From a paper:
In plant biosynthesis, the formation of glycosidic bond is usually catalyzed by uridine diphosphate-dependent glycosyltransferases (UGTs). In this work, we report an efficient phenolic apiosyltransferase GuApiGT from G. uralensis, and dissect mechanisms for its sugar donor selectivity towards UDP-Api through crystal structure analysis, theoretical calculations, and mutagenesis. This selectivity was highly related with the unique 45-amino acid PSPG box and the key RLGSDH sugar binding motif. Through theoretical calculations and rational design, we altered the sugar donor selectivity of GuApiGT and Sb3GT1.
In order to dissect the mechanisms, we obtained the apo crystal structure of GuApiGT with a resolution of 2.2 Å. The crystal contains two highly similar molecules with a root mean square deviation (RMSD) of 1.1 Å, and adopts a canonical GT-B fold consisting of two Rossmann-like β/α/β domains that face each other and are separated by a deep cleft. The N-terminal domain (NTD, residues 1-242 and 436-454) and the C-terminal domain (CTD, residues 243-435) are responsible primarily for sugar acceptor and sugar donor binding, respectively. Based on the structures of GgCGT/UDP-Glc, GgCGT/UDP-Gal, and UGT89C1/UDP-Rha, we simulated the UDP-Api binding pocket of GuApiGT. Moreover, the plant secondary product glycosyltransferase box (PSPG box) of GuApiGT contains 45 amino acids due to the additional S371 residue.
Author numbering: 3 to 454
The structure:
């Protein structure tokens, strides 16, 4: 099994750097050498996740200054949403730097996502390109690929594209509005987002996603049918077993509750919620009477979690709940026998981590294409969790709608609660099956070696 030299070149977002680095650890585990291209200051945030420093080498780059970007801005963590397009422009301006690095390091394959110009660069040097995408393949499979004679409408998305392996996915009016307006989004250097991604899909040597044949397989196959080129699966990318210790504040606090009784809620941990929603969420948790630990950033216009909390809250939940604005070991809290519920924002890494533990799944998707599709996949197709309901037009939850979803899954007599737990258990048993993750990756590496 000959050894590969891959370069990893993900979009300037921790949500993309981090999954690329986990995958880099799986590949390095098999002897493959990785050059991991990363914004230079961001590298310090990621070095500790490198579990193969001998084989995984960081290649720090300057993220160029663009007018409008704050000083030293590197990733989407440094700017509001309205400025992501300038991060994309900055990334486009690194091409000549990348070409130097590719000429001297000479990897055999480059993994990329948003760099539509990357396939021509690598092809010109005899280097293969894999567009490694962080979304679930169901997201491009369902949201693209309709007949194009007129602009796509909200009503068009209410039906699946022709040949889509499955029935129509439910989409609320607010989500439909968001989805249609996203098709027009300009993202860096004046390129339409959709053109940026589709150029990469077409000119790469292969497209790849996280996933396994039993769940993501049909969507990969469908896409391979639409574009007539390889769409690979890299495996479920399960968390590596890390011999670590949970923070004593939590091993104590969590240990003082009956097993399976605590609600962990990571909603609002990636991006600050608007104040109205932060309150309804926290009030939502308290109104379930269950123990809860809410890991989230302070809301917009607020610098601390304590300065945000509604007056009276901290008293009324003294024993029951905790609202904690500091860094948490989420994988490890979920591995605690006391946690029984998981409120996820439905990012791909969050979904995998909830799936491989025993907690019930509550799905509160943060507005986004892959987030919405994940929540629908989890709650209406695989039926492994319950969604929090939102206003049909305004997309907001309430303390009541938050309370219902966790009460449904936390009621051992509710028939939906029993159903989602059993389907969850089924998916967990597959993902942790003995051969699943390891043969996925070996097969992936066979397919990578087949591109040479």
């Amino acid at each position: 099994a000959p050894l590969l030299h891959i370069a990893m070149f993900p979009w300037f977002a921790m949500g993309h750097l981090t999954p690329y680095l986990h995958l880099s650890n799986k590949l390095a585990k098999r002897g493959h050498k990785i050059s991991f291209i990363v914004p230079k200051r961001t590298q310090t945030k990621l070095q500790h996740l490198n579990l193969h420093p001998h084989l995984i080498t960081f290649v720090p780059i300057t993220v160029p200054h663009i007018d409008g970007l704050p000083h030293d801005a590197e990733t989407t963590s440094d700017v509001p949403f309205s400025l992501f397009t300038l991060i994309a422009t900055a990334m486009d301006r690194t091409e000549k730097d990348i070409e130097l690095l590719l000429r001297d390091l000479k990897p055999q394959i480059v993994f990329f996502d948003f760099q539509h110009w990357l396939p021509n660069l690598t092809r010109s040097l005899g280097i293969k390109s894999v567009q490694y995408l962080i979304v679930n393949p169901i997201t491009p499979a369902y949201l693209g690929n309709r007949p194009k004679g007129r602009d796509i409408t909200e009503a068009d998305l209410m039906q699946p594209p022709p040949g889509f392996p499955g029935s129509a996915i439910k989409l609320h009016s607010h989500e439909l509005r968001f989805l249609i307006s996203t098709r027009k989004l300009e993202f860096g250097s004046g390129v339409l987002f959709l053109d940026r991604l589709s150029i990469g899909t077409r000119l790469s040597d292969a497209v790849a996603f996280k996933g396994c044949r039993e769940i993501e397989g049909p969507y990969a196959e469908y896409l391979e049918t639409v574009y007539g080129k390889p769409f690979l699966l890299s495996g479920p990318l399960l968390p590596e077993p890390s011999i670590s210790t949970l923070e004593e504040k939590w091993v104590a606090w969590l240990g003082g509750f009956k097993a399976g009784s605590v609600i962990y809620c990571a909603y609002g941990s990636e991006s600050p919620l608007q104040y109205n929603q932060f309150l309804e969420l926290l009030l939502g948790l308290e109104l379930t009477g269950f123990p809860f630990l809410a890991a989230l950033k302070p809301p917009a216009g607020f610098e601390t979690i304590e300065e945000a909390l509604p007056e009276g809250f901290r008293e009324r939940v003294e024993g029951r709940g905790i609202a904690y604005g500091g860094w948490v070991q989420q994988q490890m809290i979920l591995e605690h026998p006391s946690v029984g519920c998981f409120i996820t924002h439905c990012g791909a890494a969050s979904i995998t981590e909830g799936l491989v533990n025993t907690c019930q799944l509550v799905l509160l998707p943060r507005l986004g294409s892959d987030h919405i599709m994940n929540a629908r996949l989890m709650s209406t197709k695989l039926k492994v969790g319950v969604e929090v309901e939102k206003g049909e037009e305004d997309g907001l939850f309430t303390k009541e709608s938050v309370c219902k979803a966790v009460k449904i899954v936390m009621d051992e007599e509710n028939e939906i609660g029993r159903e989602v737990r059993a389907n969850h258990t089924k998916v967990r048993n597959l993902l942790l099956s003995n051969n699943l993750e390891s043969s996925c990756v070996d097969t992936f590496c066979d397919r990578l070696r087949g591109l040479l």
